[PDB]
Each structure stands twice: as structure tokens, then as C-alpha cells.
């Protein structure tokens, strides 16, 4: 009937147009109360607790707030009041994809369990938007808020997915264009997502947030750029910017990839991948689904949460004692052992196709150390993170518009070297993490041998503490000392 | 085994003695990441999902910062580090006992499942620590680390609960009394989990703390009084000292006892009831419990978590019907009404006895207005609240002692009367909501003129809205206006 | 001539009109850079470093965002882009009048240097805001942007100071009553201006505030109360309403009402009034003036600032030698010695004129106890501090209009009663604390017995460090005892 | 002379020996509170209103809490209670040298007033700390509290500025070496100063700091590294410390060098150098001083701070009348224009010789446009800005000395890559800012045809606006397209 406040602790009093109530208080939705937002990093860090749900509600609010700011500020743009609740309802919604643990299962899990599968978490949003939709009798209270279900439907969708597939957008025409770069900026990758992540992660992990998103906000404009409408940033921001990126990249060195929080991730994805065929989940005309088999069926997947983790810790289930093994192993701080961290040199890359291959080569180094203990192949666990700045190996600023003071409406490209000397050269690079399984005394040394070995034999970068850990190992190789 | 650092976004960087360590990391600690603080609250609140963990954790290391604060300001009290450790284990272990949803089960639904225990999440907690202990192995841990485990046990449930039987305590001698005033403060309700609680909940909740635990501690002594040695605080600091108890009672009318909030815990509490014959939980042996008998086996009640909720939730057996779809309607949004608050006056209590009556009452007022429907007992909810300074009728402070700059060393009191006029005249209220269960819009009307004709009745106060919910009836109440 | 941001702590980035700048890069509002917020306070608390001039930014940011919410909730109210600008402006302006150490100039420095006159802040703050406007041709920029600059004039001082004097303002019609309401509220007390200022002054204080003005802001409506459309709460808003000004009592409590930091502002008062004669300040025409009559020429009293400290600080002239030593006192930390503080009893208040009579009262007691040194009134600093909501005896909540969700355009009212038992009885006090100008340790003993008798003998309340400081004086009473 | 509490928002409650309150309570120190921390910066951002003074306590309590934390953790460092008073004090004395506007003092007027000489706040911290040692007696205090004047006096000055000149310090043996790494970091900058000023100047200016110093705190040791004992940090850290330096550099950017920021301090310190023959400031023996001789007199400097410039703009004098007007300037707002930036290109420098000569480049440039009318050199300002990460064009980090965990007395060293790819490649470079002192708009217009043909004449980055403002000479340059 009427709109409801809500109080947030990173966005203080948010306002909820009747119509977002009504999308927000159903199953689907409000599923996300019961998804961690960092999953494994709760364990490590005790005040990420927070869940999908909240962060869904942030990002739903800013990507009011800034379609609200660029109408107010131009009024030419012939931004409407369905405009705005469509680009709110595409905020609230692109976030109930996510399954359980967040970026574990669509990390980590799905690609095991379904490899012959592409899945994401926002398709998984578009299909359970849909099923909200149709659940719930969405559609004539849409109709009844001035909206047009079929476009609006579609821009929704297109807002969370992109293209659902010249102009390549159905929900909305060219002169709109600009309204496709709020709630996932396929451009660039700055979003109101990204803005309500940083300042929600960093004030429940207790690390501060260094970007602001408020002042976005008010230096953004719509330019045109090569006969099309995009969302253009005042010249001087440009520092601004790339310090944001930076900052995504400092989210994801000290919290989303911390080795423990990974290693955690990577155990729940095994007690998963023990439990998929012992553990059912009842969907659509009382069909059974497992954890693996949710995806096919959003009557299912709307149960798929959290809760499964405790299901397999407390189950009974002879069967599922290997599963419920791992887990309790994680609650005794049983974890695998972290050896350690390295990267490949010059530009050289390695390949997902061959991340499978490299605990093989691990166990296959031959320290010149003499070890009481050989470890195989599936005692080491080989972790390869990909950290850029969204786009690949691009710099995401290269595709940003400024506009200057004089001439707000004439938009103009900035390169790097207009910017600073101290910005980085590359935008890409890779990670590799190597675990251990045995977690005693000796099977760890051993470990330790084999990884520097094996990094010095891949030409890897020196490991940290290799003198350390390996002192009979580094003096081996020239190009490290 | 080495020290832990953990990054806590309430505390910061927080320093985990191995033992402490040890202890945590068992099931029966890492429980806590599965029930919320402030339960059904989160469902208000949005940025309340915050778990007692964290909370423990919190508790412990400001217990931690009071005792290591005592003892270099005064070496003279002989605090060790065994104490030390001992006061540590102590604040971390005093919240063991709670159960889903926090207040919800101690406050709500153990009262009414069974109603002859004598069920407090202080008993809960001192036996949940036993069976961790033993469980474990942590005793002979504890002698590693200099404790002597059958005295430093005793010494630690009597801080959690007081003492299990002239000087009633077993674990230290009356010139240690003041180590007992710092976990669960017995004496004034003055201890470390009120000012964690304070600080998380307010973090969380998005409503801002204005207690200064550091400054407290900065200014804590201990001073000799009647025959015992006592935690005092400097003079100066008795205004900041009411103020806390300010504090506590806004938090409570804010957040912790917001109407819709405790709804919903009844909501919950109603579905957990009539699921109870039906959710087994398997304890010791295979021997199976209940969610009302899980409270005798610690085995069970280990696995007694905010997870029954989703397991209703998710349910299929048509035993569970009852209780999923009441828990359903809370995913809806379809909660019992709320029809209004009312306070007695005079040194009149509604007495507990005096609750299930309440509902009754209600219904059988005459309100001559006519009604499209009539209204039964069980259409509404009586839900009476008492408010306090945590000592039923008495004033906290009057149990402080303090000190002054002249002469630190002696205790002395403070009346009320010798701080402010603007002070409360009165220590403890008690507030009645009453909602409905029938929702529709003449329901609602009809509920409204019964609760209004219903204070008038017992003389209660002129509920805030009374002249707008219920125009003809408010006149014949003279003393309303 | 375009809009500027101005980045601020307290509210982010907050938007200025190309007027508002225009009133702000005058010398007349650039003057509040150079006057503390709490005067002496930054000497009792490090972080309070800040100026009048942020406090006025966000003052008229707050103005703003009230109006502009009002608007865009009731576009009925018929609310111009004028008023806002005028609101606004108002809210900028209204700390114009201050003088050095804001508080400590009109209500200690000035009552003392000149007796006969009732000088206010507001009646500062509005012939400063005529001498800005007329010295920096203010009128037709205002014109420029749409503003009658009389009417319009009137307006604005109206906001700052009340009618200029049946419906008394001639800036704004009865049917716009509720503008009156925002900058200044003369009938609750309610306004933008205590928003700024407890949000500020707890951020460089080291406190923190516990009101949320934007949920009040969120909240507020106008409705009909009397035929006058005025600024109405939300009913169960009531409870923060009443912690407003519970926060404000102990904002004052332990900031602004620091017995260190008024002893301070005393000795800074006292230096000031030794200078009085000997500083020239040069106003219009070249005609000089002193400290305590620049108050009658803008131009003299636009360069009146926190300067006149340092200027008698560092000024050799043997004429200012009195007052230099006093400054210097207080930079060696040599400050008058605290005595204590006591309140009356019963019905008892303690009358302005009677101020005066207090140190001979005190040196005039007779303790009976052994005494090295007598003390005499010269020696006694009495320092009455009336302590209120804002209203004198009056409960401020009995002035504010409320409304229901049931029918927002229907104004009621909510009596004391209506909300809690735990809320004050009496809304005024007085603190009376006594300081010695002999700070040996002798002569602080004897002030001490003086003190503690006097407070006998007057049947005032005991002092907290009564029993120790004065052991032989406390049994004489009997219901101290 | 008891210890004592003051509270500071960034810390909180902070305690005070009293040998370092003795410290504070001096005119040389609370000269402090004078002095802007920030200088102009407070006329671009109005929440930077905080002095050095409270800095000063910061960075004294910050010092205390690191050598506090090694000692606790390291008792064969064997620190003692002397030490920690000594670092404290130098800590709490390291800012002692600054005058009016900090950096504008010794950064811009100095150099232009006195090129001559040689001058650096760490100097004029050392004289002013003299200085408050023999005016306040402090030596007999120094010994009361076990100090030893003669070998502490020396060690204290040490640690502001250096060796007074194998080991090099007299103050402390080579195995005490780790504790001049504390206050003023030579070796690699990492210092407690640094950390309070990222807290404080982010807590006043609105923008906010990423830098976890705690965290940092609680990772520290003191390792052996050549000969000598050196705070080392734990290996994983690395990470940190260079966004460490990234928050310095941001901090640069944002705040502290902003275009209006340092133009303010340009038109302050002309002002001073037009007020020089005029101001006097009466030092020792009633000799007169100016304001660029004031540092030749440390009883004068101690009345050099930002009152100058209220005695400036309060002038009457007709000798004073140009640099009147300035000040006058900057109140209405009437600062030089920013016409633009641009940096130098591959390995070119610009050395401090040849800046005098960069505004007659500027105007002896031939932009191939018509010009209504024509600029001179004094109609241009050219302001150098070197960035760097505290090293010139040295990694710092290269000299940071870390640990493992597993050997955690073991020193060792990590290079860049073995960090990340993604990390600047150069740690030092030019910022080159062009303003014009004729504000007209054909004037502007004429400046910036100049400067952008500047900017391609020296082979200069191109203006990030530089298609804009100039769009007849940036194509003409092929670097550029
Ligand atoms: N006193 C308070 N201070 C801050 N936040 C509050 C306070 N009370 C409630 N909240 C929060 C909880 C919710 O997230 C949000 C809105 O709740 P609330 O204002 O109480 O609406 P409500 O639905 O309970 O009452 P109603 O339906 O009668 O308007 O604000
Ligand atoms: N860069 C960071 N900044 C702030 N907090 C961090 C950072 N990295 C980790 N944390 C948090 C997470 C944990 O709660 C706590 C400890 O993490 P961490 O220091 O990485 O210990 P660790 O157990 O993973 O490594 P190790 O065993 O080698 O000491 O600090
Ligand atoms: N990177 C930043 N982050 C946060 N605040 C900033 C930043 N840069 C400047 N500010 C602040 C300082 C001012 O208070 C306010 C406006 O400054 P700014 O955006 O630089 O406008 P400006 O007047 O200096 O340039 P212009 O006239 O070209 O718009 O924002
Ligand atoms: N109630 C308060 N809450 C927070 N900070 C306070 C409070 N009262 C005072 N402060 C601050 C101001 C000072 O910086 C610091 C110390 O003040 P305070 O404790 O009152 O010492 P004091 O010198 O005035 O009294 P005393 O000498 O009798 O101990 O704490
Ligand atoms: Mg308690
Ligand atoms: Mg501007
Ligand atoms: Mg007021
Ligand atoms: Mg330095």
C-alpha cells in the first residue's frame, strides 16, 4: 500500500517505493538473508557477517540515487519515475543469483560439480528474477505503479545480464543508453555494485573504505560520446578513479583472497562436492534436486542457501560422514597448510586448461634436500588467482569519458600518462597459491621443498620466506640471488 | 602453538593466547557463528546479522583489558596471569549457552514449552563450558599453560552464573572479589558484554553508540569495601555512569524490543512450538531430543542453532505445515498487526500469572461502537515488556562505589540527589502491546476500539493514536481530554 | 558565477548556490574562521580546533535538505525555489553575531563589560548579516536570482531573531508558519541549527552523538495545529525527541559545561576585561573602538575575532602587562584550583542579581576546624550554570505536534505520561561549582571547609567528595548522613 | 603533579606523564595551537581547522605505544622506562619547529626571504625544543624522573633531526639502534608521525584513510640486520606498507597539494614577503625581528604563528597596504586563476634553479592565435610540485627489513617483484601548475593559448583539457596525436 524506511548502517534511512517492498518481501529474495556476502572470509574475519540481502537493499538504494541525481541535474535526459524504480528494481535484484557461500559456489563449486555448464551468478539472477515475477503476481502491481511489464521486464533483465541476446538493447532505446552503465557498467566496470561492496565489506572486515562514492555521484554527467549517451566523470576525478581500482585490488589482497579464507572455500567446495549425492532438495512438484542440480530449477534453488552447510554438519547419515568430516575438520581449525605464495615472470601467463597439471609438477620437483616423507600429487593444492582491474588487460580508465569545466557537454578521453608516473604499467596479473593436505611437522618441510624447487624450476618469482623455508633450495638459482 | 591476531571491525587487531585459541576452536564455541545476537531483529534492522561469536570474542578481550588495566595500575592486588587467562576464558564463554535467536529462546520459548525449568542461558552456559572442557581435552591444555584446572574451573563458571552454592565463591578468596565484578557483574550489571554489546549492536544496527568503555576502564580502581576489594570508579564519572543504563534502556526501546521485532520473535517462537514434536535432534548415543529438550544434553544442544528456522522453512512433512506456513507468512511479510502500546499507572504490575489472561480481557470489552466482526482471545497478542536499570525496582548506581582524586583509595557512594534533578524519579516500567492476528481492515478497526475501550477500562494510558484509531471512544475518558 | 561543492566531515559534500557563495566570500562570514565553536573547551578537549564558519556550512547545508524534504513531500505547502534560498541563507547566517570564544563573549565577557545592555548572538547575527549585504552589494545579486531583497530581508532576520516587532511576522505568510521553524525554533527548540551542532561537536570532541536528525528529517511533516500550518513529528518518533534533549543535557554535561573549560573562559573573560582600555579597534571613518563597544560598529566588530587572545598575548605594552600575565597563567596551566560543585534543594533557586553575594557567602562561613590562612571573597570564584531543555521549567515535548500513520494531516498532541516513567520530572537545575584563587595546598584545604559548610548552611545537596575532603564538616548536617 | 587523561578523537583517552605534561604546559609548546596543521588547505577543505598541537600529542602517544609494544613483546631489547620517556618526548617535540601555516612557512616563504640559509622544521624543532628546556627548567624534572639530561637531551634531538655530527649517534648505543626508527624515520620514513597525520588530517578533511597502523604496530619487531638492532616488519605486511606509501601519495593529491590549496599558500606567502619590512616581532632583549628573521630568535619565533596573518589583514598601516589587499583578495575570493597542469616527459627534470625562470618561458611562448591582448611574465605563476615516496626516486620499501614466521629473528628482504606486477614503476616525479594573475576572460583565454604552447615547446604531457581550452594548438603537436 504505502512506502517503507529502512534503516541501514552504511546508508543510514533508505526509501522504499511500495513496489520494491513488494519485489523485496517474497521467498526469492528474501533467500539472501541466509548467503554470506564473503562466505569463507567469515571465518577469518569474525565481522563479515553480513549477507546478500542487505548489500541487495544498498545497491538497489544507490542506483536510485544516482538516476535520481542525473535527472534532477538534466533534466533534457527525460529520465521518468519508471525509469528510476526500473533501474532500482535491476539494483535490488542482481544480486539473487548468488548460491551458497557467494563466489564459492559459482568459484569454485559449479565448475566442478557442472563443468560442462557456463554459469553465472547473474543468470542465475535473470532466472530468479523471473521466478519472482511469476511466483509472486508482480505484474499488476508493476502495471499498477506505472510500469510496462514486457519492456520493463526486459530492461531489468538487460540491466543485470546485458543483452539478452546496431543498438543491442530491447528494454530501452539509444537516448537511454546511459541507464545501462548504473547497476552493472559493462563499459567500464564502475557501478553503484562495486560503490555499496566497498563501503559494506570494508565496515564489517574492519578495514576503511578510501573511495567516495557521494562525490561520484555529483561530479557524474551523460555526455555524448561517438553518438551515443554514457555517463561521463568531471576531468579532474581521473586520480579518483584509478585510486578506486586500486582500492578493489587492496579488497582482494587483504580480505576476498586471503589464503586461509580461500583454503576455507576450497574445503566447504569438497565437503559440497561429498555431500551432492546424499543431499536432496525438494523443488518443483516434489522433485528431487541435488546441491549440483538446484540451478535447474529456481523452485529448488530458492531453498539452496547457507543452511546446507549445517545440514551436513549435523547430519546422521553414514553417507555423509566423509562430507561431515571436512567440515568438522574446518571447526577444529584442522585447515591445509598454506606453503606458499609465488608468480610467473615476465609475461608469461599460465592457463586454466593447465591449472589441473600443477599439483602433479609440485610433487614431481626434486629438492636436493633429503626428506623423510614423499607427498603425491593430491596432497598439494594449487590455487591460481587472476587480479585485474575488471577488464582483463586493459585499463578500465582508458574507457572512461571526462568532461571538462568549460564545456560540460563535450566529452574527452584522459591516457595515463596525463595522470601520474607512479600509476601501474600492467592492469593483470596471477597469483599462485600452493597448500599442502598433510598437516604435520615433516609433511609440511617436505612441502616447503617441493614448492621452492618446483618455483624455481618454472622460473617463478623467489617465494618470500624462501631462505627461510628452503635455505638449502634458493641458492640454486641465479636469477634469485 | 603461537598467539592468533584477529581483525574485529568493533575492537581492531585482537590478541588470542593459544589456550584461548584452543578453546575456540571447538564445536561447541564455533556454534556461536549460527545464532544471531539480536535474532528476529534482523528482520527489522538489516544490518543486525551479527552472530554472538563475534560477540564472545568482543566479551573476552575486554575482559582481558580490564583485568591487565587493574593489575599494572595496582600490582598490589597480585592479579597473575592465571587470573588473567581465567577472567579471559570467562568473557569468552558467557554466551555458550544461548540459543536460536538469542532472547527469543530463553525469553520466549523455553518459558512457554516447558514451563516448570528453570531454564537461564547463564545455567546453559556453565554447562555447555563443561562439556567443551571435557569434550576437548582443554584441562590438561589448561595445566600446560599454569592453570590449575579444578579451582580456575570453578573459578570460571562462578563468574558466569555466580556461585554454584560470609564468602560464597570457591574459585578465588574474598581478596580477588573484585575479579567477579568484571565478566557478569552480579553487584550492578556494570561488565564487559554490556559495553561489547553496546559497541556491536550499535555498529550493526545503524543506530550510534554515546558510552565510553575506555574511558571507564582509564579510571578504574580497586578500593577496599566492607571487608571486600571492589571495582570503583572515580567520582567524576558517576553522570557517564547512569548515562550507561540511558543507554541500555534506549537501545531496548529502539531496537531490541522494536513491536515489529518482537512480533516476529513471537511469530517464531509460535512456529518453533508447534514444530516440536516433529524436529529430532540427535544427541549423546543417538539417544534423540527435542527442540525443547535439547537443553538437557549439551551433545544435542550443540547442534541447536538459528538453523531450525530454515529447516522448518524448507520442510515438506505435513506435520510441519503449521509451523512452516507461519514462518512462510513472515517471509510474506504477513505479520499479526499491531494495535497499540499502553502503560498502568500507580504501583500497579501485571504480574507474569497474569499474562495468558490478558488476551481475554481484550475481547470481552464493551466498546459501543458498532462492529462488522467480532474479536475472540486468541485474535490478539499481550505482550508486556518490563523496562529497568537491570535491578528490578532498585537504582544501580546506588550500588556503585566510587573514589575521589584526594583520596583514591576510599571508597565512598554517590546518591541520586547529589548528581542531577533531571534524573529518572523511577527504575522500572512495564509497557503493553497488543496486536491482532485477524489482519483484515475491519478486523483491525474492530481490534482497535476493543484495545482502546480495554484501556480505558483498567485505567491504563491514553494510548498516542487514540484520538485518530478510535474517535468514539476516547471521549468517555475524561482524564484523556 | 556556478554552483560550488564544498567537501565537509560532518555531511559530506554539501551544494552552494552561486548566492550562498556570494554571501560567503564576504569578510564578514570569512570572519567565523577565526572564532572557536566552544571557546576555552579546545582547552580542555585538543580536538575541538573547530570554527563558527563549517558550523554555519552546515547549518544552511541542513536548512536546506529540511525544506527541500518538506517540499517534495507536500508540493501543497506551495514551497518556492525563494524560500528555500531565504531558508538557507537564514541558516548561514545565524552565527554571524558571535563573538571570540563564541559562548564565553555575550554570556560571560560582555554581561560584566557592559551591565546596562541586552546583547543576543541573534541581534549580532542580524546587523552583521545588514553590514554584509549592504557593504558587498548583495541586493541585486539576490535580485538576480529571483529573491525581493525587503520582504525577503525581513524574512531571513526574522528566522535568525523572531518577530521584529495575532500573527507577528511581516517576511512570510501565517500559511508558511512552519518555515519559521527550521533555522531557529522558537517553540520547541527543534531545529537544524542543535543537528550541526551535536553531530559536529562530537566528532572533534571525542564523544559521540546519539541522535539521528536525518530519520527526524525523514519524518517530519506540516500540519494544521491552531489554523497555523506548522512542522509535525511522527508520533512514535517521541522517544528520540526526548533523547534530543537528553543528549543536549549531557553534551553539556561533559563538554561545554567543563569546569576546567569555564574556569578557563572565566580567566580568559577576566583577561579581556583587564584589556579593555587598551585595545583599540578601528571601525568607520576611522574611528576607534575597545573590546566590549565594538559590538556597535560592524566594521570594528567584523575584525573582533579569537585574534584579541594573541594580540594581548604577545604585546609588550606595559598598560596590557595585567591581562598578559592572566593568558600566561593559563599557558603555564596555573589555573584557579577546582573547590567543588553542589545544587539547591527543595523549591530553592538561586537568582541572577544574587550572583554576585556568592564568594563573600562562602568566604563568609565558619567550618571549625584548624585553619592556616583565612580566605576572602577575592579568593572564591561562584559559578552558576543553569542547566535546561531549552524552555526554562517547561517540558519542550509538550510543544511539539505529532501524527499518526493512520491519517498523517490529523496534528494531536502526547503528554510525558503518554511515552515513559523513566523521564525526568523537573526540565531545569542549577549547578553551582566553586573555584579557589589559591591553589597552595594550605589555602586549598581552608576553600574546601568553607565550601562544604556553605553548602550546610544554604541546605544545599552534599558535594560527591564531601566525606574526604571535609570529614570534620559532613556529620554537622544530618541528611548527609 | 600527577599523571593525566586528555581525550582525543582520534585515540581517545591518551595518558600523560607528568614529565610530559611539565613538557606541554609551556608557551613553546602550546604556541602549537596555533598553527594550522594544513596551512591553506583549511580555505578548500573547512573541517582541516586543526592544529599541530594536537598532531603533537598524537604522534607523542603513538611513539609511546610502539616502543611500549617492542618492549612488552622483546624483554632482551632490554627497554627501559627512560627510554620510553625519551621517545615520547621526541615524539611529542617533533613539530616544534613549524610556523605560521606549517608548510607554507618553510616549503615557500623561507626559501623566497631567506635563500641564503639552509632551513627545515626538524631544525628549528631542535632549537624550540632548547629553548623550552632552559626557559622552563625542565632539566631538574627530566632528573626526578631518572633521566639523564646530558646523554637524553642529546638523544631526544637525534631522533627529531638526525645525527648533531660506524654508529653516528651519541644519544643511544648502536644496540638501541631500532629506537630511532620510531619518531623520524631516515632510514625508510616509516614513522608514528606519519600514521597520526594520515588518521588526524583524514578524520578533519572528509576523506578517508586506509592505513591500519595498529595492525602494523602488532606486527613489529626488532630483528638484527648489519651490525644493528632495526625494527622489522612480519613479511606479509609488505603489501601494506606500500599502500602505505599509495595513501601519502593519495593524501598529496587530494588534499595537500590541491591547485587552490597551494595557490592560497602562494598569495599568503607573498603577502608576507610585501609585509616583511613592516611586521616586527620583539624577540630576546627587546630586539625587533621580522617575520622572515623571527627563526634567528627562538623568543620571537615563539610568537611567529598564524596570527601574522590576522595582524596583516587587520592593518591599518599604509606600509602595509599591498600586502593588505592580498590577504583582502583572498576573503573575497579574488585568487589567481589555475590555467592548467602538465608534466615533463621520459627522463627530463626540472631543477630548483631554473624555476624563477619558468613564467618568462610561458609568456615568451608564440601560440599561432589571436590574442585580444598579451601577457608578460608576473602575469604567470608557475608552482613545481615534487611527489615522491619520501626517497627521491628510491623504493623505499628496498630499505624496510622483514620477518618470517617461522624465524622470526631472522631478517631478511623482499623486492618489488615479488610483491606485484601491479606497483609503480617509478617512485618519484614533477607536477608543473600554470596560474594567471589576470583574471579576465580574455586574459584566460590568452593564458591558456600560452601555456598549452608551452607545454609543446618543452615536450610537456598534454593538459588533460587541453582539446578544450585550446583547440588551435593541441593539434599541432604529433607526441600528443
Ligand atoms: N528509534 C529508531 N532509531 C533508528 N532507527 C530506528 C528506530 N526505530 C526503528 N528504526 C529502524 C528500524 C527499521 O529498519 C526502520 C524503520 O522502522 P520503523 O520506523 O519503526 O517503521 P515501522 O514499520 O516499525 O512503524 P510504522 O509501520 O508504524 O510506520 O528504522
Ligand atoms: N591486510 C590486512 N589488513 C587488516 N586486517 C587483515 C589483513 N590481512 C588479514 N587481516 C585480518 C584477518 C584476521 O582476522 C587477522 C589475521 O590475519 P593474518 O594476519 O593474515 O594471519 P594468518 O593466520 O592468515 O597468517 P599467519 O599464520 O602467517 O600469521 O587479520
Ligand atoms: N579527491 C577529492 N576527494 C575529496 N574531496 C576533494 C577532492 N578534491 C577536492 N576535494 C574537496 C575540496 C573542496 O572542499 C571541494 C571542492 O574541490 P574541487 O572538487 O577540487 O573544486 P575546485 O573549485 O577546486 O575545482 P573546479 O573549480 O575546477 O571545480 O571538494
Ligand atoms: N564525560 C566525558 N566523556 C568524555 N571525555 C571527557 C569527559 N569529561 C572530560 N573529558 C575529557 C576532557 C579531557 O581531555 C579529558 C580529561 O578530562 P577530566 O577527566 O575531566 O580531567 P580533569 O583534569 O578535568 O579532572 P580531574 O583533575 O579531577 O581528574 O577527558
Ligand atoms: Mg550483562
Ligand atoms: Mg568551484
Ligand atoms: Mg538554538
Ligand atoms: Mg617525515
Redesign the interface.
Known amino acids: 500500500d504505502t512506502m517503507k524506511?529502512?534503516?541501514?548502517?552504511?546508508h543510514?534511512?533508505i526509501?522504499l517505493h511500495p513496489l520494491l517492498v513488494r519485489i523485496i518481501?517474497?521467498?526469492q529474495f528474501?533467500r539472501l538473508?541466509?548467503i554470506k556476502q564473503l562466505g569463507g572470509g567469515?571465518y577469518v574475519?569474525?565481522?563479515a557477517?553480513?549477507?546478500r540481502?542487505?548489500h541487495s537493499?544498498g545497491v538497489g538504494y544507490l542506483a536510485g540515487c544516482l538516476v535520481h541525481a542525473l535527472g534532477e541535474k538534466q533534466p533534457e535526459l527525460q529520465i521518468s519515475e519508471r525509469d528510476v524504480l526500473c533501474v532500482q528494481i535491476a539494483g535490488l535484484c542482481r544480486n539473487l543469483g548468488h548460491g551458497p557461500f557467494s563466489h564459492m559456489f559459482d568459484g569454485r563449486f559449479i565448475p566442478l560439480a557442472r563443468p560442462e555448464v557456463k554459469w553465472t551468478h547473474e543468470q542465475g539472477s535473470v532466472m530468479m528474477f523471473e521466478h519472482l515475477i511469476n511466483s509472486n503476481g508482480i505484474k499488476p502491481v508493476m502495471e499498477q505503479y506505472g510500469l510496462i511489464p514486457e519492456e520493463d521486464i526486459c530492461f531489468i533483465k538487460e540491466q543485470i545480464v546485458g543483452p539478452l541476446e546496431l543498438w543491442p538493447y530491447k528494454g530501452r532505446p539509444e537516448n537511454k543508453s546511459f541507464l545501462y552503465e548504473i547497476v552493472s557498467n559493462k563499459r567500464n566496470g564502475i557501478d553503484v555494485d562495486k560503490w555499496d561492496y566497498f563501503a559494506r565489506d570494508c565496515?564489517?572486515?574492519?578495514?576503511?573504505?578510501?573511495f567516495?562514492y557521494?562525490?561520484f555521484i555529483?561530479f557524474a554527467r551523460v555526455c555524448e560520446v561517438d553518438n551515443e549517451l554514457r555517463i561521463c566523470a568531471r576531468?579532474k576525478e581521473?586520480?579518483?578513479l584509478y585510486?578506486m581500482f586500486?582500492?578493489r585490488?587492496?579488497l582482494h589482497?587483504?580480505a576476498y583472497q586471503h589464503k586461509v579464507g580461500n583454503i576455507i572455500d576450497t574445503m566447504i567446495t569438497d565437503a559440497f562436492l561429498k555431500a551432492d549425492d546424499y543431499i536432496e532438495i525438494?523443488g518443483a512438484g516434489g522433485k528431487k534436486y541435488r546441491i549440483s542440480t538446484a540451478i535447474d530449477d529456481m523452485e529448488a534453488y530458492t531453498?539452496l542457501?547457507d543452511?546446507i552447510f549445517?545440514?551436513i554438519?549435523?547430519s546422521?547419515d553414514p553417507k555423509l560422514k566423509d562430507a561431515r568430516e571436512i567440515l568438522?575438520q574446518i571447526?577444529?581449525?584442522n585447515l591445509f597448510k598454506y606453503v606458499g605464495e609465488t608468480?610467473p615472470?615476465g609475461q608469461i601467463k599460465i592457463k586454466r586448461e593447465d591449472y589441473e597439471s600443477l599439483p602433479k609438477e609440485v610433487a614431481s620437483a626434486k629438492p636436493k634436500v633429503l626428506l623423510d616423507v614423499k607427498l603425491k600429487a593430491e596432497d598439494f593444492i594449487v590455487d591460481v588467482i587472476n587480479?585485474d582491474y575488471g577488464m582483463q588487460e586493459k585499463n578500465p580508465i582508458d574507457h572512461v569519458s571526462?568532461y571538462?569545466?568549460?564545456?560540460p557537454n563535450?566529452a574527452?578521453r584522459?591516457t595515463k600518462?596525463?595522470?601520474?608516473?607512479?600509476?601501474?604499467?600492467?592492469?593483470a596479473?596471477q597469483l599462485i597459491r600452493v597448500y599442502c593436505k598433510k598437516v604435520d611437522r615433516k609433511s609440511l618441510y617436505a612441502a616447503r621443498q617441493y614448492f621452492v624447487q618446483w618455483c624455481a624450476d618454472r622460473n617463478f618469482?623467489?617465494?618470500?620466506?624462501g631462505?627461510?623455508?628452503a635455505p638449502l633450495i634458493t641458492p640454486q638459482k641465479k636469477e634469485w640471488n
Chains 1, 2, 3, 4 share one sequence.
Not at 417 to 427: H, R, T
Open positions: 524506511v529502512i534503516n541501514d548502517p552504511i543510514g534511512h526509501e518481501d517474497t521467498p528474501q538473508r541466509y567469515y574475519f569474525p565481522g557477517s553480513h549477507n540481502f542487505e537493499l565496515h564489517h572486515l574492519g578495514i576503511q573504505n578510501n567516495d557521494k562525490r555529483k576531468d581521473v586520480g579518483n585510486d586500486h582500492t585490488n587492496s589482497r587483504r525438494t531453498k542457501t543452511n549445517l545440514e554438519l549435523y546422521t568438522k571447526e577444529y581449525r608468480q615472470t587480479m571526462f571538462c569545466k568549460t564545456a563535450r574527452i584522459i600518462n596525463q595522470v601520474s608516473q607512479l600509476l601501474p604499467e600492467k592492469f596479473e618469482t623467489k617465494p618470500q620466506d631462505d627461510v623455508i
